[PDB]
Symmetry: C4
Subunit: 253 residues, 4 copies
Amino acid sequence: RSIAFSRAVFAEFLATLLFVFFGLGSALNWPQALPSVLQIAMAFGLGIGTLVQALGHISGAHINPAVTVACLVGCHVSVLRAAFYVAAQLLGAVAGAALLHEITPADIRGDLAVNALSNSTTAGQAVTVELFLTLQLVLCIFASTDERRGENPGTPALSIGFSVALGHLLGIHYTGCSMNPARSLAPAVVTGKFDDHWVFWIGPLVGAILGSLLYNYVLFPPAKSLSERLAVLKGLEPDTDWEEREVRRRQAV
Amino acid sequence: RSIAFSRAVFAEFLATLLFVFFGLGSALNWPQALPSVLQIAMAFGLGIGTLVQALGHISGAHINPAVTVACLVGCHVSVLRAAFYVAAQLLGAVAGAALLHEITPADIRGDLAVNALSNSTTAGQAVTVELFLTLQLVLCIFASTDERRGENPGTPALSIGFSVALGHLLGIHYTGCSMNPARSLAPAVVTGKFDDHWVFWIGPLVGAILGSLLYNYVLFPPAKSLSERLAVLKGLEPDTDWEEREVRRRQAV
Amino acid sequence: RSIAFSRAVFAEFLATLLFVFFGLGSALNWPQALPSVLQIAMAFGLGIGTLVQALGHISGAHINPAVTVACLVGCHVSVLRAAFYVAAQLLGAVAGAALLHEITPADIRGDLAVNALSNSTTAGQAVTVELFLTLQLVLCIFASTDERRGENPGTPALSIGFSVALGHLLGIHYTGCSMNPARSLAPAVVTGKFDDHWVFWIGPLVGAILGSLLYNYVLFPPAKSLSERLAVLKGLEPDTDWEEREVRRRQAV
Amino acid sequence: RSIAFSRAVFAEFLATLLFVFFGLGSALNWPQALPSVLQIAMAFGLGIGTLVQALGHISGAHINPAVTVACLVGCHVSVLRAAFYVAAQLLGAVAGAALLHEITPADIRGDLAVNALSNSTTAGQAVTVELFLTLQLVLCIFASTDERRGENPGTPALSIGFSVALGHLLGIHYTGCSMNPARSLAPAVVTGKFDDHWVFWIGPLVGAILGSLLYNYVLFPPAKSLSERLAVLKGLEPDTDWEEREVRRRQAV
């Protein structure tokens, strides 16, 4: 402790401020012109894609606590680097979310794009949808940040962005799409609406972990943890058969 | 038999579950907000693009039996690996398709995006459209998975995704766009609607094979099958002319 | 004469069939659902992007006579390879355009997306717009096919596609956007509507050439034509100054 | 002075002509069909992405004085090369903007997409939004033009384009989105509407500089300016401790 990391820690702060600012803002109920699911999907997806590009080298652009946690369960980040990230992400989030409230005229800042269950979907259903929404993202982020595969280097930024977008295309009708506890918290804070908030903390965290676990373990990534104690296996591994050869011979004598 | 393949087999299962879940879901008749052709095009196209990215290394992301079959006619996959894929794809498909029925409120899960002929288009026409819809995809997938060309490495995921999207942009008005027997089966199963189902099994399979055949044979890919018996040609190849030289000389004597 | 070229010649045929089929089809006046400028923009742009990807290695994916001509004025293609391309492009075009008429129910195949002046725009204006629409494309195609720059290898397919898209986003309101004499001819043929057809042959050809000329000459590409006769310059180049040195000395004596 | 630079200077002229021509044009109030926020977002974003691709090698495709200035504050361009750029950008801008007025029928060229405060947003708010709109772009442009990172070479053109797009998705509702003093000036000129024009010169310039400063200094880019006088530090750096060792010893004697 500590060096460039502090700045990297910062980078996330700038990222989640920006993403939430643009994101929520682009999803408001503008009376003269009203946001379509796609546009709102594009806006976030592009927002992330843009950030993962900008700050990808500096931070890994988690830009999302669930992603961070996914990165943690998968042992891609420190335990310290995780906490500082989430902290910044939550703070960076409510920062932009406030800047937006200030920047927007009173008539149309209504909801502020808080995450909220729609079409009579149960918090039980809703949370299920959020689970998958994030996992799919986590699966993308990992395949594209995966060092093992640099031959298909492109395209972590754009692919992720559009993954996020894909999340929205479905997850809006159920929830308006959190995928990102930071994202869903900031507006809930400023606006005071915490209805079924937990949904946007469990669905993501759960899908994100599952995601992390499947890529890190269910599929990939072959390597040796070295703590597997492969020195014990090699003692019996040849010797047990030598023993069978050696012990069966001495039974012969 | 058998190793990582089993997992790869799995990967497809996860892929077709996800793609169909997001896909159908994003194409439902949401009363408050209704899906435009583009959005529904983007949603699938992005879904595939995202998957080919995520699971591309693990599976080849066929995510489609017609693609798999295309890959088979083109000798890009095993005969065993094909069957297991299709199996998983069909099962992975109806899996997400069910998860969606459960997750969606009763009022708006109506059709469930089953594939169904629209605008008084004949199953004869419809099937013709599906033919081309898939071929074009198959042509893309191959050009982008083509090993011979790594200099233009990018961009198999995004290009494929958007290819899929391109498929939808037209194939929706005729059929709502199958390109993918798995995709069109899952909803037909759960919903019981099997009207003109065959269309979504023949159009794709046919276009996919054609596609596979043109890239594998009509154009490319120069290599030697070695079973061409090029050892017989080389016996006559020089010697026939030596024979003409040698036999015309001995006619001179 | 002749080898793989014949097939490459073919590749264009398959490309322009496909692009026009999907393209026109996706831009028809569907009564139940009607195409927005974007969707129609995306549909073509994606169509090209997809093709340049699929057949890029085989053909260069001109997919457009104006592009071909641009490639000709820029000396990127043979004079023979050009003609065969254009021929195939025109034939490939009217081929898909027919397939579409056959595949589409009578009620909604109306216009068939023929190119036609809109919003009381003069053929004089219209043609001007088409000029720029294509040049911009030609400028993109060249920068992305430019061998001199392989460090930024990506992304010829996607960038071109979206360039095409960009063309449509503006060129639809003026003309429905030709950029491609093949594209605008096929529907004019089948439908019999040749109103102001020339516009879609001059605007493109003109913008395409201009485009070709600026990249090939106004900017780039440094190389030696060797016919510049740089052997004459090198005789005077040093010797004229030696002569000044040598002749001024002998004037001194 | 001077060589290819003159042409490069030109390249910007061609770029800002094109971008503004397509851009404004695609954002006009077309009566029969009216531009959605996305489409207008796509149109510019694609326009830039296309240009950064086409002319990226020749110019750096600033295509924007604020970007240029950002590039200046960050010492990425000459002081001379900056001025000529801005000059050309402003002139290239009003050039296309005029070409558009001439090309468009009188009924629908109304606003001409001038930048203008909307939804009762204060020039104070408005300018704040513009600040962030550009910074985010500047952050992207730099991360993607950053030489230090060629391993993730892609994708400067597309990522930038879509960054621009992201700018529009939000910045339209507040201002119709300038991000680009050139862009906002051209229409204000031709149309005579200079209402709150300053907003579109301060917001961008301010966000662009901030952006430039954070990437150039707050984060990155490790290098040595050599004017840091690291020769003074190295005199005391070892010697001060040798002095402590040497001076404490002589105090011992």
